[PDB]
């Protein structure tokens, strides 16, 4: 029964202009292995979630040079270098490492 | 991979004069299994 | 290239049984795990619960008492199976790969969302 | 089959003679994962009585 909130409801950036998402969870979200496990997704208006980055900082092959992030045990944040329109829509912070999985609002990235 | 070929009848046993007819399963077949050994035969000595 | 074909009960009265499958078209069951996932903005992604091949499943402990999930392997389909549907199960439910924790702990191959209403 | 303990073991029965078989047992063991990716469905012909 870990909460997990997103520090943002939403960041409009303008164009070009950096943007970064911080949220966190109740408890650490440190596994058995000891390793530390969240993920980032990241939803279209007409699109399910998809995945952006996974455990804390590692990127899916095909990610944009955009995208990076860090943090550990209840502090984390997901960082575009540069907002662009493409990179519009929710983010979600999700748990990662334990069973009653639970994730974030969700992040409204807007252009400004 | 292995490529495989699929058969339905069967010479069981080598029992010439009968063999069984596999009916298909309903579809979508997976299994795994575990390769606990091999039986393996040396090419015998040739006349070298 | 996992591709997910999903339909079901969009629409249910209060206290009904919903009913959703999601077929896979390129493996089998314990190459990944299924899961399933609840859209309903205000608490974000909302996990359900999730099967294996071999059946084994991890509820939510939320609604252990309400849901039900099987594998029928042979017809390579997931099914999501909820009792007793009140107001705050409406939302969309998508059918997840879910990788192992040790690979990427992560979530890909979303279907495109069942949608689900529970109305008079 | 069982496993073999502690190492891989051969078992001939007569390594000097050309006709035989080696019966190996192995360690720890392989997984071998079997498909036959196709969906089928089933008729019912009523061949005889
Ligand atoms: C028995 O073993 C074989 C051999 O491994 C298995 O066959 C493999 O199946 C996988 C899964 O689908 C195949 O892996 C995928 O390959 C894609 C590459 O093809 C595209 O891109 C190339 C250019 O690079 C184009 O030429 C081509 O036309 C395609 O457009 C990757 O793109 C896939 O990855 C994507 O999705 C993942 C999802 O998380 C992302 O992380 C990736 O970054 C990427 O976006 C994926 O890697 C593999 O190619 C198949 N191999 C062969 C030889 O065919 C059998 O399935 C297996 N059978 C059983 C029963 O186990
Ligand atoms: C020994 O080597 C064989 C290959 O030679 C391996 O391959 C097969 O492995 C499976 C799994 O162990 C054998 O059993 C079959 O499992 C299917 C899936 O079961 C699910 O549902 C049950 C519900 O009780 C769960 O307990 C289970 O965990 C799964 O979630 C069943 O669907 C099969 O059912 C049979 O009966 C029904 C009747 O309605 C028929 O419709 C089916 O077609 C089928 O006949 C079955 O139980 C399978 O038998 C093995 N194949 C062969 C040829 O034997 C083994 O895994 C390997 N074992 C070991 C220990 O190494
Ligand atoms: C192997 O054979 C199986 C049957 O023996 C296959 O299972 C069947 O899959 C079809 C899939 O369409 C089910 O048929 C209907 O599907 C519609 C949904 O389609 C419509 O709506 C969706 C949106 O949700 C949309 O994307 C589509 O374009 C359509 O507009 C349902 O509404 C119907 O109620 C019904 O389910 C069959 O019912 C199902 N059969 C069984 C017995 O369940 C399987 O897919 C085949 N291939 C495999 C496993 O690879
Ligand atoms: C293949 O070998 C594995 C490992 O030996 C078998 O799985 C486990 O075996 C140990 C004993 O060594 C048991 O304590 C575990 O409970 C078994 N786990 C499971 C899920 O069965 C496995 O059954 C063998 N066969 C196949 C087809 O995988």
């Known amino acids: 029964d870990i909460v997990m909130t997103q520090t943002p409801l939403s960041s409009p950036v303008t164009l070009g202009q950096p943007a970064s998402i911080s949220c966190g969870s109740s408890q650490s979200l440190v596994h058995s292995d000891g390793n530390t496990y969240l993920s980032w997704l990241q939803q279209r208006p007409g699109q399910p979630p998809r995945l952006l980055i996974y455990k804390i900082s590692n990127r899916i092959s095909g990610l944009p040079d955009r995208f990076s992030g860090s943090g550990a045990e209840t502090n984390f944040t997901l960082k575009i270098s540069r907002v662009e329109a493409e990179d519009v829509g929710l983010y979600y912070c999700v748990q990662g490492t334990q069973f009653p999985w639970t994730s974030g609002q969700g992040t409204k990235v807007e252009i400004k | 991979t292995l490529p495989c070929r699929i058969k339905q009848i069967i010479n069981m046993w080598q029992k010439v004069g009968k063999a069984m007819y596999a009916p298909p399963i309903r579809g979508q077949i997976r299994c795994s299994s575990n390769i606990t050994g091999l039986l393996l035969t040396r090419d015998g000595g040739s006349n070298e | 290239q996992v591709q997910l074909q999903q339909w079901g009960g969009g629409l249910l009265k209060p206290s009904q049984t919903l009913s959703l499958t999601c077929a896979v078209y390129?493996?089998?069951?314990?190459?990944?795990?299924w899961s399933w996932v609840r859209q309903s903005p205000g608490k974000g992604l909302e996990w359900i619960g999730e099967?294996?091949?071999?059946?084994?499943?991890n509820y939510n402990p939320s609604l252990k008492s309400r849901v039900t999930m099987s594998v029928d392997t042979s017809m390579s389909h997931v099914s999501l199976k909820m009792t007793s549907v009140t107001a705050a199960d409406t939302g969309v439910y998508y059918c997840?790969?879910?990788?192992?924790?040790?690979?990427?702990?992560?979530?890909?191959?979303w279907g495109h969302g069942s949608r689900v209403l529970v109305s008079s | 089959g069982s496993l073999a303990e502690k190492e891989v073991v051969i078992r001939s029965q007569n390594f000097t003679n050309n006709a035989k078989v080696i019966i190996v047992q192995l360690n720890e063991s392989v997984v071998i994962n079997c498909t036959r990716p196709n969906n089928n469905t089933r008729k019912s012909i009523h061949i005889a009585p």
């Open positions: 390129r493996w089998t069951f314990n190459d990944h795990y």
């Open positions: 099967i294996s091949w071999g059946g084994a499943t």
């Open positions: 997840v790969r879910v990788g192992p924790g040790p690979h990427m702990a992560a979530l890909d191959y």
